[PDB]
Design a protein around this ligand. Structure first.
Ligand SMILES: Nc1ncnc2c1ncn2[C@@H]1O[C@H](COP(=O)(O)OP(=O)(O)OP(=O)(O)O)[C@@H](O)[C@H]1O
Ligand SMILES: Nc1ncnc2c1ncn2[C@@H]1O[C@H](COP(=O)(O)OP(=O)(O)OP(=O)(O)O)[C@@H](O)[C@H]1O
Ligand SMILES: [K+]
Ligand SMILES: [K+]
Ligand SMILES: [Mg+2]
Ligand SMILES: [Mg+2]
Lengths: 524, 96, 524
């Protein structure tokens, strides 16, 4: 359709007004004293949230140029949530401050391209200084503090996430889901815990629990679906000769074969039980082979060539314990070679590195946590649905912050890290004066997270920013108690990945936005 | 023990060729069921229109070629698979 | 679409106006002197209701920010109805009072996050004090009083519900349905009373009633559907040798088998009667096994292995009496082992605990009541459809209140339980002054149910609240007689679960709502 075209300072003012609207919506949540934002949902109750990415996503303005500004600065929070999962509010606070100060220098006649080059140089040096300033975060108390701070100073969430990471180890996978109670519940599972139940209700060895218990059972892995008892009849006879129980992981055991095997189960000759193979095509085979590696067995398939008729006891897998139930199944201490397990771990890690999709990579990480280590599920307990959503978002942010802490390290929180970085970058210079001014607006905008935290606390941002800049090291401002001290000692830690990602994405988008002169939108 | 009747023969099918001529191992339908098998039991012989029994040309323990179809039947003797057919279904005897 | 964004006190005022609209619609029904609310239904006559959850559901406002407030505070009544089924009006009264007093402290410059923390601490301590203050409610007179009070002081409803729980016992299931008469009717059924009639009209042994009566009959349970007489022909011959009547519970009996068995019925060799198996797949087997456990028999199925040809008299179930009618079928004194029966109750109770869906869990509870105890159906009698709906809602609320009374206990009604709890929590303190103020607004808002009850009575809420606070123990205000006295002696009891749930959900939503600063909605 027809277009409205704005040029120069008019377009810059409209875009900055949109950025200010989005950033003022976002930044009322920053810090521990930050407040919540209600987002109207056309389907369901409104969402009360303290995370900046949701309130950034929900912002869309009537003025098309202001809507441009809002969308472009919303990209900052979207990217910061995609990469680190935390610091979206900090990223938007940084992006707004670079844009306002960058447009001040743009209105001062300085070249926006050179300003963007200066911002990029300053933020590259800032990332280097953050990496130098960072301390690795491996101990449990530091992780608990990171999870607490990232969850609006909720010590319960931080300690629960610290315990979960301690339980599942470094290779473990932790996810957050809703709970039925009012309290946070941690559910840690070990070994293979694929979510398929028994094909028939009659396998139950323990009727008082509905769970089949198999002590040191054999494990058959059929990559094909079976409906006749003929094929594994030699295997069934060999198992009956051995006398140990047998568990089948197959694509489908149904009809005739299933009926005869449950009949043989209640006859007592074989304590057999069959369950469906997990996943779907191109994924079922890989983690079926993972189960085989864990249990020291081999998968029976037509592609690999051997049939169930020539399958023997050596072909079948081995574990010390097997638990069947309605929804899932647990295999405890599969008898497999350790070196093969680590080789499979390395292979799936290489697949993770080669994976360019979040879904495939997260499935591979889940498989790694299944075969090695454990899986933790955090049930968010809340009296109401809106508190469930708010607490779930906070726990997710805390989990992402703990993951970023172990990935890259921690720095002093509350924006003190960016303050120290900007203080260290005082002598950085560009190629010309416009680049130096861009560096200076980048350094000044690194004070924006601390200033906005103090503004949310109700104190004076200038006084506290100058006081923190006067101090050295991790000395900073406790925004909850409104005091001063070594931010590490008071447990206010920020993930280096979160702060660095927020700074980088804010700098990139903000430089691209201050470089603009003309904006072309649709007419109202 | 099983011995057949009239002009019919009891034959154990030979093992399927797992490997081809030049060392290529065939599996599945490439390892198709063998038409050759050793003779396990020969019947008394064909009864003609005169009521006389004419002894069969096949002999016990001779590898022969059989044609699978409606004529051939499957059976299990001492937990081993054997096939049942008539002398017409037997094609030829393998010698040397 | 484009968004309107409101910040700070403007957004808080709009949200509070919406909350006030919903809560003023809801709270005109609180107490015995509370009035009714007419809700317009686009399909059918308008609904006159005294329950606060229907009024809360039907409130939606033109102003989008006020509509946010309405939906958020409607979540309180929705959650209170989902959890306890009663006290939705009390929950909305509590939620509104926390929000108004919380926003008063928010406007007073106090930190909303610390106010929410104080409210949560005060309400946790309040739940503890309600649990300490609660007395278990097992006697029939207390149950009758709870059902009466929860049904707008209707003694008939309370006494009917008390008689129903006395008849069906603790394991029984009681439900409310519309009646044809003008009076309330109680219909209690014992044993298995699944709702399938006879497959053919000619089974009727008693033509003057249309009901087949079988005295000490054999029962055959066919999991599969049968269309040929050959399969149970050995069983039919064995039954004819025994001479006792036989009842079939099958998936389907039709065609030649059905014709043969009805012909043999009117020939007098066997007194057989075949009916359909109840329910559908994955639930039919479980309740068929329940029938087998009750009658001491075994279900014939292909999965279990035994066939109808191999079925014998020992395989068949045994009962003392069987009644067949057009809609249902009653089995009286099924001859089964008691220990197996209680093991089945334990197994289905474990399934109930594992069940996370209301439909599946209520079907399991209905199965438990069928196998052990009884099932009561209360027919609501009213001269008109609108009175039918109103009386049905009142009886449903009374039933939920009696269930909560046996589940958790009872306390003094009329909001005096919350008054005593707030009096006990006078010395509770938070981590700072904002948390202490949040505790204080929680304690003050616990007086809101009593104050709104007095307001509905037309008296002065402050005088009565001070008079009740001056008293000790269960001394409180009879709102029907406008008198004072021991509320337990006066028969005004509230379920501890109802009051605690109302307080908890009101506190959670109200704290989350007072924490807000910005609200983002669609443009009008
Ligand atoms: N008690 C505290 N004292 C000082 N600073 C604090 C305190 N608690 C949190 N902070 C700081 O607040 C900053 C941002 O907090 P918050 O979690 O609200 O925002 P965010 O991470 O930018 O947001 P989002 O979850 O939307 O990504 C962090 O830099 C953190 O160090
Ligand atoms: N005669 C009475 N004297 C004093 N208080 C009473 C009397 N009858 C009822 N109440 C009190 O009225 C309060 C609420 O009554 P009502 O049943 O109308 O509301 P509710 O249970 O909050 O609402 P809803 O059915 O919508 O969930 C209860 O706390 C109850 O103790
Ligand atoms: K935030
Ligand atoms: K009411
Ligand atoms: Mg955050
Ligand atoms: Mg009520």
């Amino acid at each position: 359709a027809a277009k409205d075209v704005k040029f120069g300072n008019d377009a810059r003012v409209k875009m900055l007004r949109g950025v200010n609207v989005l950033a003022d919506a976002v930044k009322v949540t920053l810090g521990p004293k930050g407040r919540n934002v209600v987002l109207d949902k056309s389907f369901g109750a409104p969402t009360i949230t303290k995370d900046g990415v949701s309130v950034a996503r929900e912002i869309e303005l009537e003025d098309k140029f202001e809507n441009m500004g809002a969308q472009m600065v919303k990209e900052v929070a979207s990217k910061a949530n995609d990469a680190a999962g935390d610091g979206t509010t900090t990223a938007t606070v940084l992006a707004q401050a670079i844009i306002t100060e960058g447009l001040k220098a743009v209105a001062a006649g300085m070249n926006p391209m050179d300003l963007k080059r200066g911002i990029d140089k300053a933020v590259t040096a800032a990332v280097e200084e953050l990496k130098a300033l960072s301390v690795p975060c491996s101990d449990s108390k530091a992780i608990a503090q990171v999870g607490t701070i990232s969850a609006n100073s909720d010590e319960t969430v931080g300690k629960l996430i610290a315990e979960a990471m301690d339980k599942v180890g470094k290779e473990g996978v932790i996810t957050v889901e809703d709970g039925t109670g009012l309290q946070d519940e941690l559910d840690v599972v070990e070994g293979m815990q694929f979510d398929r139940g028994y094909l028939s209700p009659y396998f139950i060895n323990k009727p008082e629990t509905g769970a089949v218990e198999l002590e040191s059972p054999f494990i058959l892995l059929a990559d094909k679906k079976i409906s006749n008892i003929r094929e594994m009849l030699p295997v069934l006879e060999a198992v009956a000769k051995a006398g140990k129980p047998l568990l089948i992981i197959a694509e489908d055991v149904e009809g005739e074969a299933l009926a005869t095997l449950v009949v043989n189960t209640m006859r007592g000759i074989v304590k057999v039980a069959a369950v469906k193979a997990p996943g779907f095509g191109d994924r079922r085979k890989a983690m079926l082979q993972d189960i085989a590696t864990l249990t020291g067995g081999t998968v029976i398939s037509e592609e690999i060539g051997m049939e169930l008729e020539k399958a023997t006891l050596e072909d079948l897998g081995q574990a010390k314990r097997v638990v069947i139930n309605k929804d899932t199944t647990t295999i405890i201490d599969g008898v497999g070679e350790e070196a093969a397990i680590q080789g499979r771990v390395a292979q799936i890690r290489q697949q993770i590195e080669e994976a360019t999709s979040d879904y495939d990579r997260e499935k591979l990480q889940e498989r790694v946590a299944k075969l090695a280590g454990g899986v933790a599920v955090i049930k968010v307990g809340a009296a109401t649905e809106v508190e469930m959503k708010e607490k779930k978002a906070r726990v997710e942010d805390a989990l992402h912050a703990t993951r970023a802490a172990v990935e890259e390290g921690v720095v002093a929180g509350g924006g003190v890290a960016l303050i120290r970085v900007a203080s260290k970058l005082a002598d950085l210079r560009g190629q010309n004066e416009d680049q130096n001014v861009g560096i200076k607006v980048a350094l000044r905008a690194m004070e924006a997270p601390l200033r906005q935290i103090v503004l949310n606390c109700g104190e004076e941002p200038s006084v506290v920013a100058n006081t923190v800049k006067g101090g050295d090291g991790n000395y900073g401002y406790n925004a909850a108690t409104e005091e001063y001290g070594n931010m590490i000692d008071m447990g206010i830690l920020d993930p280096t990945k979160v702060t660095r990602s927020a700074l980088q994405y804010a700098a990139s988008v903000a430089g691209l936005m201050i470089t603009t002169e003309c904006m072309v939108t649709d007419l109202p | 023990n099983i011995r057949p009747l009239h002009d019919r023969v009891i034959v154990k099918r030979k093992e399927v060729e797992t490997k081809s001529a030049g060392g290529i191992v065939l599996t599945g339908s490439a390892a198709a069921k063998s038409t050759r098998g050793e003779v396990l039991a020969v019947g008394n012989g064909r009864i003609l229109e005169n009521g006389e029994v004419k002894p069969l040309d096949v002999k016990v323990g001779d590898i022969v070629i059989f044609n699978d179809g409606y004529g051939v039947k499957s059976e299990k003797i001492d937990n081993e698979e054997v096939l049942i057919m008539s002398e017409s279904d037997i094609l030829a005897i393998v010698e040397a």
